[PDB]
Amino acid sequence: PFDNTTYKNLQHHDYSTYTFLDLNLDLSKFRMPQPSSGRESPRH
Amino acid sequence: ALFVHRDTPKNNPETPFDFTPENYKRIEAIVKNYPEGHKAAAVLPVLDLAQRQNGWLPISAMNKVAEILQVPPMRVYEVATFYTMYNRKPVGKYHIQVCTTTPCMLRNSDSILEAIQKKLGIKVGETTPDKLFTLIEVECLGACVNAPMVQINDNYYEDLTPKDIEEIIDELKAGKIPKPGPRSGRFSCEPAGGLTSLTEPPKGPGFGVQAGL
Amino acid sequence: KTSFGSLKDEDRIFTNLYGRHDWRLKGAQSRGDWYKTKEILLKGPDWILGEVKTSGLRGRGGAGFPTGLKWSFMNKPSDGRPKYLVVNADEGEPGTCKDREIIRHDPHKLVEGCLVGGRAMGARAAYIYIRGEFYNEASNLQVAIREAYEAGLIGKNACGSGYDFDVFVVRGAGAYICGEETALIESIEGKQGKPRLKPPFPADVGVFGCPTTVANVETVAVSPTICRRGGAWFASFGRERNSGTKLFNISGHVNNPCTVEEEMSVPLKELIEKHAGGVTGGWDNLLAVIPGGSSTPLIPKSVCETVLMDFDALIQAQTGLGTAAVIVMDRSTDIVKAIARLIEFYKHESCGQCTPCREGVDWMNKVMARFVRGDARPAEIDSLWEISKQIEGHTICALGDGAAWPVQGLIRHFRPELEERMQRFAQQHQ
Amino acid sequence: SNLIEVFVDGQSVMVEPGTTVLQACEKVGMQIPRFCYHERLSVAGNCRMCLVEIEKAPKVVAACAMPVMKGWNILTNSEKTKKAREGVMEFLLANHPLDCPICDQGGECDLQDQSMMFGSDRSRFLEGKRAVEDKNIGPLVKTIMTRCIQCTRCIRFASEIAGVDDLGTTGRGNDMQVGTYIEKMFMSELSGNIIDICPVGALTSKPYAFTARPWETRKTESIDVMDAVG
Numbered sequence: 037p038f039d040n041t042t043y044k045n046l047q048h049h050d051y052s053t054y055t056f057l058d059l060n061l062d063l064s065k066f067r068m069p070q071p072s073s074g075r076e077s078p079r080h
Numbered sequence: 081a082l083f084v085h086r087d088t089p090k091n092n093p094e095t096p097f098d099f100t101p102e103n104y105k106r107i108e109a110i111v112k113n114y115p116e117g118h119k120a121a122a123v124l125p126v127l128d129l130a131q132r133q134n135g136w137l138p139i140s141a142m143n144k145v146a147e148i149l150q151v152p153p154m155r156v157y158e159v160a161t162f163y164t165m166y167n168r169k170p171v172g173k174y175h176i177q178v179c180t181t182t183p184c185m186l187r188n189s190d191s192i193l194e195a196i197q198k199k200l201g202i203k204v205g206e207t208t209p210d211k212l213f214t215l216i217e218v219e220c221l222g223a224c225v226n227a228p229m230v231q232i233n234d235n236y237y238e239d240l241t242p243k244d245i246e247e248i249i250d251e252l253k254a255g256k257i258p259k260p261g262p263r264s265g266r267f268s269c270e271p272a273g274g275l276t277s278l279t280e281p282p283k284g285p286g287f288g289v290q291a292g293l
Numbered sequence: 294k295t296s297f298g299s300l301k302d303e304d305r306i307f308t309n310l311y312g313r314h315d316w317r318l319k320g321a322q323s324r325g326d327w328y329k330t331k332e333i334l335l336k337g338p339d340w341i342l343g344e345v346k347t348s349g350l351r352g353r354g355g356a357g358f359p360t361g362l363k364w365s366f367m368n369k370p371s372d373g374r375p376k377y378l379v380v381n382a383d384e385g386e387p388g389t390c391k392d393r394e395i396i397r398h399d400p401h402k403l404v405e406g407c408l409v410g411g412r413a414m415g416a417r418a419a420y421i422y423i424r425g426e427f428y429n430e431a432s433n434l435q436v437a438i439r440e441a442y443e444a445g446l447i448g449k450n451a452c453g454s455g456y457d458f459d460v461f462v463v464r465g466a467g468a469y470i471c472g473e474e475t476a477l478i479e480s481i482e483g484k485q486g487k488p489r490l491k492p493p494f495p496a497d498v499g500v501f502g503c504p505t506t507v508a509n510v511e512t513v514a515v516s517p518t519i520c521r522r523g524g525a526w527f528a529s530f531g532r533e534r535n536s537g538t539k540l541f542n543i544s545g546h547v548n549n550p551c552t553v554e555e556e557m558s559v560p561l562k563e564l565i566e567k568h569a570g571g572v573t574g575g576w577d578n579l580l581a582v583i584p585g586g587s588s589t590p591l592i593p594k595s596v597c598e599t600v601l602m603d604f605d606a607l608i609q610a611q612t613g614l615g616t617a618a619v620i621v622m623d624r625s626t627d628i629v630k631a632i633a634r635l636i637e638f639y640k641h642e643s644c645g646q647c648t649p650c651r652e653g654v655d656w657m658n659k660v661m662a663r664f665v666r667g668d669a670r671p672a673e674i675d676s677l678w679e680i681s682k683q684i685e686g687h688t689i690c691a692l693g694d695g696a697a698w699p700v701q702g703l704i705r706h707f708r709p710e711l712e713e714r715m716q717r718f719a720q721q722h723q
Numbered sequence: 724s725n726l727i728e729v730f731v732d733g734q735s736v737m738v739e740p741g742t743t744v745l746q747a748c749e750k751v752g753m754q755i756p757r758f759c760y761h762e763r764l765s766v767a768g769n770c771r772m773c774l775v776e777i778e779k780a781p782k783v784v785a786a787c788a789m790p791v792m793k794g795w796n797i798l799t800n801s802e803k804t805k806k807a808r809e810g811v812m813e814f815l816l817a818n819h820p821l822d823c824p825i826c827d828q829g830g831e832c833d834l835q836d837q838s839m840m841f842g843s844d845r846s847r848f849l850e851g852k853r854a855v856e857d858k859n860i861g862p863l864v865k866t867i868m869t870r871c872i873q874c875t876r877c878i879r880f881a882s883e884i885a886g887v888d889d890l891g892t893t894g895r896g897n898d899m900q901v902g903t904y905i906e907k908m909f910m911s912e913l914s915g916n917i918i919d920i921c922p923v924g925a926l927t928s929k930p931y932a933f934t935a936r937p938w939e940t941r942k943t944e945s946i947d948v949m950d951a952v953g
């Protein structure tokens with residue numbers, strides 16, 4: 037049934053204060069290896 | 081609004097602060113999100129993470145963030161003083177921010193302001209005696225078609241009248257969580273006099289794809 | 294074609310703008326998103342750049358630079374450093390809320406636009422700098438990014454094309470000056486959000502010293518639709534150098550403030566009368582309209598009758614299009630109070646690096662407060678004008694121009710109102 | 724040879740690639756006024772005094788940071804260059820305190836000298852000035868931050884030469900203060916040299932304070948014997 041009268045963005049009522057960081061931590065296992073500049077720090 | 085720090089027993093470098101181990105794992109993920117050799121970028125999220133440990137920043141999270149990322153503490157002080165979303169003073173549990181820019185001023189956000197001030201018995205920048213509310217005045221928060229609007233913690237309460245913000249305050253005092261949405265009939269951004277556009281159902285895939293693709 | 298406006302629902306790119314349909318992967322996939330992306334990735338960067346420079350799409354951030362050329366200086370062979378595409382999702386400008394709805398309701402469109410753009414310039418990864426206050430939108434974008442990562446659309450072997458691409462979400466910390474592209478680049482790197490000096494342009498030295506292209510959400514989310522439907526389809530709307538569709542946020546003293554997409558060269562009166570439901574108290578109750586938020590100068594009712602809302606017809610009308618954010622003030626508004634509030638906003642959002650803005654915006658705030666109180670003389674007014682002429686063009690970033698323009702517009706259009714206010718103060722208190 | 728041709732006030736001169744406008748004008752012989760620029764520090768460009776005009780171009784460019792290209796004619800004495808200088812220095816002197824008689828920098832102040840040279844002759848500022856809270860950084864450098872113009876030679880000297888990384892800017896806007904944010908002493912080998920490279924009287928020498936005046940002191944060129952550097 038095509039419903040054009042209900043707001044479908046209802047998930048954001050359930051978000052806590054640690055939702056974004058936990059989502060990043062769960063996503064971090066799918067990421068590429070980061071390129072390196074050849075040094076630990078610019079002050080190194 | 082003082083940008084210099086004086087050492088107090090409440091806010092001293094020997095104030096106890098340390099991240100939880102789950103926050104250590106989150107900090108490690110934040111650091112791994114950035115290129116090697118540029119760990120200092122992780123100053124921006126992790127310090128905010130420290131705020132989510134306390135709700136405010138004493139000068140012990142700044143030194144800890146500087147220590148775990150090999151940056152001088154003055155850079156962390158610069159980051160914490162440049163941005164306005166980092167609380168360097170102990171704010172209440174429910175931090176209320178009222179937008180009073182011109183697209184919100186035209187729709188009478190000052191009415192919301194005096195209603196909140198009359199209800200809570202406090203002024204702008206003043207904390208409640210029971211440390212439950214803290215009312216300040218901020219700039220535009222990017223929901224100007226839903227004017228007037230306020231932000232409580234990380235939630236947006238938009239298109240309010242004085243009655244709705246009174247109801248929101250009484251619901252916050254009771255311990256319940258109100259729904260972060262507009263208090264009028266509309267949901268997100270549609271006109272109140274019915275949907276003027278986007279009434280047609282979506283076409284779906286394969287529509288308008290040019291040849292040779 | 295000469296008559297523009299009244300855009301049909303078939304040609305609107307931003308379906309599910311109002312959020313009535315599903316915002317997740319399955320809801321977006323049944324609307325046209327993520328369809329034949331691997332064909333575009335295999336056709337490659339030259340074809341994508343040609344298809345986005347054939348459409349005549351300009352920068353929807355507010356400067357109107359051509360998107361094809363701006364994405365074309367970055368296309369160059371590598372010198373050992375990676376390439377990056379960064380999406381400006383700040384919208385600290387008052388009146389503008391379109392990209393908030395784009396991110397919250399159509400995040401997969403933004404991710405597909407990031408993938409197509411990063412294929413166009415050979416970018417290694419994508420950085421999305423969302424606003425600090427937009428926690429729920431950031432979480433929605435992260436959920437959509439994880440859903441696209443799970444299906445193999447991005448990450449390892451993106452969309453079955455052999456190309457490597459990533460997406461990162463970096464939350465802000467509540468700064469308007471971080472919306473500037475060089476200040477955004479500096480704020481990604483963990484420093485204070487202070488803009489750099491061009492040259493070097495970000496196409497040569499950008500984030501972490503790597504080649505970088507900073508693009509708005511609105512001009513990124515429409516790139517797959519341009520590359521799929523065709524450049525001529527996007528160029529069939531509006532005037533020449535005014536092609537495409539634009540999102541307008543109409544607010545202020547209107548009956549129904551709303552965000553609506555429209556043809557790029559729609560008349561202002563038709564847009565206000567049709568979508569916003571009309572000005573409060575009728576059309577004859579109009580006093581002033583700000584076409585593109587606090588950066589662009591205001592225009593009175595005499596010009597708003599026969600004006601077109603594109604780039605050329607607004608630069609010719611001694612103002613700018615900006616972000617296409619309509620702020621409407623009727624006869625029951627104090628214009629001087631509104632401009633004073635705008636200058637107070639500009640002095641509360643100013644990085645303070647370079648001298649002319651750091652001193653002159655505070656000077657303009659004090660002078661405008663005295664104007665609102667009326668404790669001033671007419672001979673100061675032109676002096677205030679000269680203050681703006683000492684700020685515009687002498688600053689690092691364009692916040693100085695964006696602060697000098699409203700004062701110049703208000704003075705040039707309502708000098709008699711200011712003079713009446715100060716002479717009333719003089720004849721009353723003295 | 725990779726030397727390219729540029730013009731300063733119509734006079735042709737050879738420059739190396741990567742040369743700034745300021746260095747080319749110095750090679751011709753013109754000294755463009757500057758506040759934040761230093762030949763031994765990194766280019767910051769946050770004072771906008773060096774705004775010089777390139778002909779056939781509708782904008783002034785920062786001569787301390789703009790790299791020259793071929794065919795450029797630099798107008799160091801045109802009308803809009805002087806207008807930009809006067810506006811920038813009017814903004815600079817809008818919030819400066821009236822501390823000249825009680826200042827150790829008086830008589831050798833860069834701000835006074837280029838105010839007489841390139842500045843205007845009167846002030847249109849009819850508002851209230853700011854007042855920055857003072858700081859303590861040791862018994863060597865006397866700090867009066869009401870007179871600082873936020874030139875950021877402090878930060879660049881302490882970050883690139885002294886290597887302390889303990890000086891910075893806290894704030895955003897007209898209330899941005901150059902300091903240390905805590906009661907920290909700026910003790911270093913070269914901690915006095917900031918007094919040399921402060922264009923205003925914000926950082927003065929505490930032992931020398933309130934003792935003499937630069938116009939009545941005889942200068943004798945001599946050699947240090949304190950160490951073996953000479």
Ligand SMILES: NC(=O)C1=CN([C@@H]2O[C@H](COP(=O)(O)OP(=O)(O)OC[C@H]3O[C@@H](n4cnc5c(N)ncnc54)[C@H](O)[C@@H]3O)[C@@H](O)[C@H]2O)C=CC1
Nearest residue numbers: 354355356358366384385386472474494588589615616691
């Ligand atoms: N969307 C928003 O939230 C806001 C928008 N604005 C609008 O944005 C504009 C000001 O922004 P700017 O970025 O300073 O405008 P514009 O001067 O800089 O330049 C636009 C883009 O073109 C690039 N560009 C220009 N010349 C180039 C060249 N020769 N080579 C390579 N790249 C080049 C710049 O790097 C930049 O990314 C104004 O129109 C203002 O109204 C202002 C405030 C907020």
Ligand SMILES: Cc1cc2nc3c(=O)[nH]c(=O)nc-3n(C[C@H](O)[C@H](O)[C@H](O)COP(=O)(O)O)c2cc1C
Nearest residue numbers: 352353354381383384385472473474508509691692
């Ligand atoms: C003070 C200031 C704030 C800005 N804020 C934004 C912003 O929030 N969002 C945006 O897309 N562009 C903003 N811009 C414009 C950017 O400089 C630039 O146009 C944008 O990052 C990309 O524009 P484009 O669409 O032409 O690629 C701002 C510019 C200035 C001077």
Ligand code: SF4
Nearest residue numbers: 644645646647650690
């Ligand atoms: S114009 Fe203002 S906000 Fe922009 S760089 Fe200069 S001081 Fe910073």
Ligand code: SF4
Nearest residue numbers: 822823826832923924
């Ligand atoms: S620093 Fe210069 S301009 Fe300022 S009070 Fe001292 S002598 Fe006067």
Ligand code: SF4
Nearest residue numbers: 871874875877921925
């Ligand atoms: S104290 Fe002097 S040297 Fe330091 S930033 Fe201020 S003006 Fe520059």
Ligand code: FES
Nearest residue numbers: 184220221223224
């Ligand atoms: S003006 Fe209040 S949300 Fe933008």
Ligand code: FES
Nearest residue numbers: 768770771773787
């Ligand atoms: S000397 Fe060039 S901007 Fe200061």
Ligand SMILES: [K+]
Nearest residue numbers: 918921923926
């Ligand atoms: K000095």
